[PDB]
Amino acid sequence: QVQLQESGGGSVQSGGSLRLSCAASGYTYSYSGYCMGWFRQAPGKEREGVATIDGAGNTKYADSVKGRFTISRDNAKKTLYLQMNSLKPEDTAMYYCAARVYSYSSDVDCRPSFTTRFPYSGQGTQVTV
Amino acid sequence: QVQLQESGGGSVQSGGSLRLSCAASGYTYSYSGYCMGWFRQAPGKEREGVATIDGAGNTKYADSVKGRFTISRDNAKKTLYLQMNSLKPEDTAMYYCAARVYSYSSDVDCRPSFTTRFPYSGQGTQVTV
Amino acid sequence: QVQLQESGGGSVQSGGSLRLSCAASGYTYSYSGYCMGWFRQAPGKEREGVATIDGAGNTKYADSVKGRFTISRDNAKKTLYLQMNSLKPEDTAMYYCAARVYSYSSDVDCRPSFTTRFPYSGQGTQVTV
Amino acid sequence: PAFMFNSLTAEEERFLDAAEYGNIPVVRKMLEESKTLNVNCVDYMGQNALQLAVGNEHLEVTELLLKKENLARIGDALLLAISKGYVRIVEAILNHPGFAASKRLTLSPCEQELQDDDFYAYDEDGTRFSPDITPIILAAHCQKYEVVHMLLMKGARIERPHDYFCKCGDCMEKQRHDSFSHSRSRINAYKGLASPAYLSLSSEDPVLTALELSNELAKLANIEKEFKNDYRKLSMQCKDFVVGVLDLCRDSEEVEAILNGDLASLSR
Amino acid sequence: YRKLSMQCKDFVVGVLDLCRDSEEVEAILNGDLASLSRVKLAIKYEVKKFVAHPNCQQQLLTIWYENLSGLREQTIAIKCLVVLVVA
Amino acid sequence: PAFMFNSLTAEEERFLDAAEYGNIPVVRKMLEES
Amino acid sequence: QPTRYQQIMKRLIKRYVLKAQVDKENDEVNEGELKEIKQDISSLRYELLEDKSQATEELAILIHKLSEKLN
Amino acid sequence: QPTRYQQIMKRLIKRYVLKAQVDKENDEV
Amino acid sequence: NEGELKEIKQDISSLRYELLEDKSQATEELAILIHKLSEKLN
Ligand SMILES: [Ca+2]
Ligand SMILES: [Ca+2]
Ligand SMILES: [Ca+2]
Ligand SMILES: [Zn+2]
C-alpha cells in the first residue's frame, strides 16, 4: 500500500555530507505514527540496518553509523530525511528506505536491525564514497 | 568536556600488583555520579572492557579479570583507581580510562562491555607483563 | 570454606547407570540453601555445565544430559547425588562438583552454565564410557 | 485558556513526556546527544523536567537531570520530594552543589527570605509552598520521620516563633509590613514544632517539650482568635503525642519516667 | 442546582484559603489592586464560608479595629468598661 | 538529632540500601566478595 | 555517659517512631501512592524494553560479523 | 502587559490547580 | 492500607534490580561471544 521512493544519492569523500530523501505515497494514512527507517545493502555484504525513527520521534542508529548519521521525518511532507556526516569508504551501498505502518510509541521492533524486515521498502539509491 | 589522563603503567610478572590512576579534569561537574570504567586494547586483539563503577559504588568486572582486578573511585579527588592483583601475560595492553557523565544508580549501561562506548576516554597507558 | 569431594566414578557402556556422590565438609553452614551443581571437563573440550539444584529443590539440566541425568541432594547428609541414566561415549569427562553458598529460591544464577563459575568446586572424578 | 501557566518544540515535548513517565533511556539520550534541547523547558503548568520527574518519583530521571549544571528549580524539587516523602530523591537532591556546598538547609525562614535568590521558586513568580516554609518545617508538616532526621543531621532546625507580644525590631517590622503573613508564618512554624516527628527527633525530652508546646498553643488560640482552630488543632496534636508516648510504656520503670520526668513526684 | 451552587462556593472558598500574604487577600476580597466588593457580593450571595474564612476575617478585624491598635488585644471586661464610659 | 538510634561507611550504606530496596544482585555480591 | 532516664526516654522515643511508622502504613491508600507505583511500572517498562532492544542489536552485530567469516 | 491584579490572580489560580491535583491524589483509591 | 501497597512497590523495585542485572549478565555473555568470534575471524 505504502510506496516509498529514494533520492539524493551522491559521491563524496573525505568527511563530506549528504542528504538522502524518502518520499512516501499511496495509502500513507496516519503516516505520522509510522516507524520509518533506512537500511544498507553493501555490494559484498548482507542487508544492514542503519537508522530508524518512531512516531513519537525516538531515533535509533546502528553502532557503525552512530554519531555521524542522523534521521529525521517531516510528517506534514510525508518525507524521511537521512543526514550523513563525515563519510567513510565502508559507507558505500544500496540504501533502501523502509516503513512499518503498524507501530506504537517506544515500539520494541522499531530498531535499525528490524528495519530490514519492515513490510514496505523503497527501490533504493546508490551512495558511493 | 571531561579530560581523562592515565598513569601508573609498569612492568611486573609472577603474581605482582599494580595501581593504575585516572585523573579527571575539565568540566568534571557532578563527578560523583559518573559511570567510570577501564577497558583494554591488546596489541593484536580488539578493545576489551575490564572494569566499571557507577555513582552508587556498584563495581562490575569482566570474567577475565574478575577476582583479581578491583576498581575504586575517589569522588573528592576526582580520581579512578584500578588495583591489579596477580598478573598474567595476557594482561599486557593499552589500558584506557573511560567516563560516562549521564548515568544513574544501577544503570544497565554501566558495564565493562559498554566501557568501550563511553563518550569520553583517556589517552591510555601501557601495561606489560 | 566449603570443601567438596567426589566419588563413584566408574566405567559402563550400552545404556548403563551410574551414581556420582558429592560430600561437603568444612564450613557447610546453611547447606540446605546452597546452589549445588555438577559440571563436566571433556579431555579435548572446555568446561561444560551438567546439572544444578537450588535450595528450594528446583533442578536444571543441560540439553545434552536432559532426560537422562537427574540431580538430587540430601540436605541432612550434606550430600549431592547425580544419577546417570543410559550413557553415551560423549559422557566421558572429569566431572567436578560445585557449590554456591550465597543463593536464593529461584535464583537466576543457579544454572548449569553458571555451575562452572561457582565459588567452590571439588577435585573431580573420572567417568569413562 | 484564560491563563498561560507555561509553544514547546517537538524535541521539548518529547523530553518532557520522557521525564514525566520515567522514560530513562530517552531522557539519557536527549541529555547526552541533543545540543539544542532546553533542559529547563516547562509543561502547560510551568513544571520543568526535574519537577515532573520528582512528582512522579522517577529517581533515575532525577539523577540524570541533576548532572546538568544549568538545571533549575532544584530547591522546589527538594520541597516537592519532601512533601511527597520520596527519601531517595531527597538524598539525590541534597547531594546537589546548591545544598552540599552551601548552608541553605541551616537558614531560618527570616534568613532565607533576607536574600532574594529565588532558590525555592517553582516558577517566575512565587514558590510552591509558603516562603517561610523551610525544608525542615515542610518535613515536619508532612510527618516524614526519615526526612526530618536527615535534615536534623544536616543542622536544620525549626526556629521557635517569638512571643505574640514580642517587641523586637523584626517582629514589629513584620507586623507593620504584613500582619497576615506574620500570623501565617507563625502558624507554619508552630505546625512544624507541634509535629510528632519533629517533637520526637529534635527534643531530648519530647514529652516535656510537647506539654509546654501544647500549653503555649492553647494560649495562642486564646489570643489569636481568627486562627483559633489551627492553634487548637496543634495543641491537640501535642496532647496526642504525649498520650501516645505514655500508651507505649510496657513496665513500671517507663511509666515512672513518663509520669515523674526522671528516675513519686508525678510532676508530669 | 444546589449542589452546583455549593461547588462554586467551595471553589471561591478554596481560592481564598490559598492566599499567603496581604496582597493576595486584598486581590481576592476587593476584586482589584478597601472596597471589599467581593466580600459584599459574598454576603449578598450568601457565600458564608467565604466571609467566615479566617483569611477574610483577619482583614475584617483590621478594618474593624482601625485606629485602635492595642484595644483589639484587650479582654471583654475592658471593652465592656469602654462601652460603659462611652455611654 | 537529639537521639542517635543507630558513622556508616560507604560500603555499609550501599549494603543497607541494597537490602532495604531488594537489590538482590548487589546484596549477593557484597555477601560473597566483601 | 547517659542517665537511666535518658536511656528510657531514648527507648520510648524509638518505640514511638516505629509505632508511628506502623500506624502510617495502616492509613488508607490514596491515589498518589497508587499513581507512584503506576509510574514505577511505566519506568520499568521503558528500561526493560530498551535493554531488550540493545541486546537484540548486539545479536544483530554478531549475525553480520559471523556472516562475513562464513562467506 | 498584565496588571498586578492579573498577575496575582494567575499565581493564585496556578496554586489552586496544583492544590486541587494534590488533594485529588489524596482521594481514596 | 499503605503498608500493603508499599510491599508491592518493594516487589517492583526488587524485580527491577533482578531483571536489569539479568539483562546485564546476558549482554556480558554476548560480548564474550563477540570477542571470541573476532579472534577466529581474524
Ligand atoms: Ca520510581
Ligand atoms: Ca495514604
Ligand atoms: Ca480514587
Ligand atoms: Zn520578636
User: Cα(B117)–Cα(A6) distance, rounded to whole angstroms?
Assistant: 32
Q: Could you give the CA distance from residue E14 to residue G41 in angstroms, rounded to a whole number? A: 34
Closest to I18 measured CA to CA, from F27, B102, B110: F27
Ligand 1 centroid to residue G40 C-alpha, Å: 4
For the CA atoms of E55, E56, E62, E65, the dihedral, rounded to the nearest 10 degrees, stands at -130
Angle at C51 between CA C17 and CA C111, to 5 degrees: 170
> Is H19 part of the contact surface with chain D (CB cutoff 8 Å)?
no
Residues H8, E27: C-beta atoms closer than 8 Å: yes
Task: Calculate how far, in angstroms, residue E68's C-alpha sits from the geometric centre of ligand 1.
Answer: 56
* Residue numbers belonging to the annotated binding site of G for Ca(2+): 28, 31, 33, 40
Interval between CA A72 and ligand 1 midpoint (Å): 31
Q: What separation in angstroms does the CA of A119 have from each of A97, A99, D220? A: 11, 7, 76
**Cα separation of C32 and D175, whole Å?**
72
- Counting ligands in written order, the one closest to the CA of G31 is 3
Q: Which residue, among A75, A124, A120, has the nearest Cα to A96 in the 3D structure?
A: A124
Under 8 Å CB pairs connecting chains G and I tally to 68
Those residues whose beta carbon sits under 5 angstroms from the ion ligand 1 are D 57; G 40
Which phi and psi (to 5°) does residue A117 adopt?
A: -105, 15
Q: Say which of I20, I23, I32 has its CB closest to residue B63.
A: I32
Question: Taking CB atoms and an 8 Å cutoff, what residues of chain D touch F22?
Answer: none
Residue E18's nearest CA partner among E9, E32, E28, E8 is E28
Kindly list the partner chains of chain G, i.e. chains with 3 or more CB atom pairs below 8 Å.
Answer: A, B, D, F, H, I
Q: HSE on the CB side for A87, CA within 13 Å? A: 20
In this complex, do H5 and E32 lie within 8 Å of one another by their Cβ atoms?
yes
DSSP annotation of D158 reads P
Is residue I26 within 8 angstroms of chain B, CB to CB? no
**Which run of H or of E encompasses A38?**
strand A35-41
Q: Which three cell numbers stand for residue H14?
A: 496556578
CA neighbor of G8 nearest in space, from D252, D196, D194: D252
Contact D1, D37 (CB under 8 A): no
C-alpha cell at C37: 551443581
- Contact status, residue B20 vs residue B8, Cβ threshold 8 Å: yes
Distant-in-sequence, close-in-space partners of H22: CB < 8 Å, separation ≥ 6: G32
Residue D87 to residue D148: CA distance in whole angstroms: 10
Please tell me if residue G52 touches chain A, with a CB cutoff of 8 Å: yes
Residue recorded with cell 507512584: G36
Angle of helix E54-64 relative to helix D179-193, nearest 10 degrees, comes to: 140
Q: Which residues of B12-34 are buried (b: 16+ CB within 10 A; e: fewer)?
A: eeeeeebebbbbbeeebebbebb
Q: What type of residue is E7?
A: Q
B2-7: strand order across its sheet: B2-7, B18-26, B79-84, B70-74
Sign, CA dihedral G39-G42-G47-G48, equals positive
What's the gap in Å between H23 CA and the centre of ligand 3? 11
- Give residues with Cβ within 8 angstroms of C61, minimum separation 6: C50, C51, C52, C67, C69, C70, C71, C112
Ligand lying closest to the C-alpha of residue H25: 3
Q: How far apart are CA A58 and CA A41, in angstroms?
A: 24
The Cα E80–Cα A49 span in angstroms is 92
User: Distance between CA C88 and CA C12 in Å, rounded?
Assistant: 9
**Do residues C49 and C100 touch, judged by C-beta distance below 8 A?**
no
User: How many whole angstroms from D143 Cα to the centroid of ligand 3?
Assistant: 23
Longest dimension (CA), chain I: 62
CA C69 – ligand 3 centroid, Å: 55
Residues D22-35 as b/e (b if ≥16 CB within 10 A, e otherwise) read: bbbbbbbbbbeeee
What cell numbers appear for C110 in the block? 543457579
Residue pairs between chains A and D whose CB atoms are closer than 8 Å: 10
Q: Do F23 and I10 touch (CB under 8 A)?
A: no
Contact assignment for D3 to H7 by CB distance below 8 Å: no
G26 → closest Cβ in I3, I23, I34: I3
Ligand nearest the Cα of residue D159 is 4
D17: closest chain A residue by CA = A56
Closest CA to D156 of D143, D137, D169: D137
Q: Which residues in E3-49 belong to E strands, given as ranges?
A: none
Q: Which three three-digit cell numbers place residue F21? A: 530496596
Q: Which of I20, D195, E46 is nearest to G52 (CA)?
A: I20
Provide the 3-class DSSP secondary structure of residue C20: strand
Resolution of the structure, angstroms: 2.2
Angstrom distance (rounded) from CA A63 to CA A50: 9
Q: Kindly identify the ligand whose nearest atom is closest to the C-alpha of H26.
A: 2
Give φ, ψ of B30 to 5 degrees.
55, 45
Parallel, antiparallel, or unpaired for β B2-7 and B18-26?
A: antiparallel
- Distance, CA of D129 to chain centre: 8
Q: How far is CA E87 from CA E76, E83, E84, in A?
A: 17, 6, 5
Instruction: Kindly give the distance from the C-alpha atom of residue G36 to the centroid of ligand 1, in angstroms, as a whole number.
Output: 7
Q: Can you tell me whether residue C7 is helix, strand or coil?
A: strand
Inter-residue contact D6 to D51 (CB < 8 Å)? no
Q: Given CB atoms, is E18 within the 8 Å cutoff of chain H?
A: yes
CA angle B110, B116, B119 (to 5 degrees): 75
> Which distant-in-sequence residues (6+ apart) come within 8 Å of D29 by Cβ?
A58
CB contact under 8 A, G12 and D258: yes
First to last CA, chain I: 62
- Contact across the interface for F11 and B106, Cβ inside 8 Å: no
For F10, other C-beta atoms within 10 Å of its C-beta total 10
Question: Are H15 and D126 inside 8 Å of each other by CB?
Answer: yes
CA of F20 to the centre of ligand 2 (A): 21
Strand duo A120-121 + A93-100: pairing? antiparallel
Beta-carbon neighbour count of residue A118 at 10 Å? 25
Q: What share of chain A is helix, strand, coil (3-state, %, to 5)?
A: 5, 45, 50
Which residue in I16, I17, I20 has the most chain F C-beta atoms within 10 A of its own C-beta, making it the best mutation to test that interface? I17
Interface test with B, best of G43, G44, G47 (most B CBs within 10 A): G47
**CA dihedral for D236, D242, D248, D251, sign (positive or negative):** negative
Cα of D27 to nearest chain B Cα, Å: 10
Exposure string for D129-164, b = 16+ CB within 10 A, e = fewer: bbbbbbbbbbbbbbbbbbbbbbbbebebbbeebeee
The beta-strand segments (E) located in D14-121 are: none
Which grid coordinates are listed for C126?
Answer: 573420572
Does G42 sit within 8 Å of D143, measured CB to CB? no
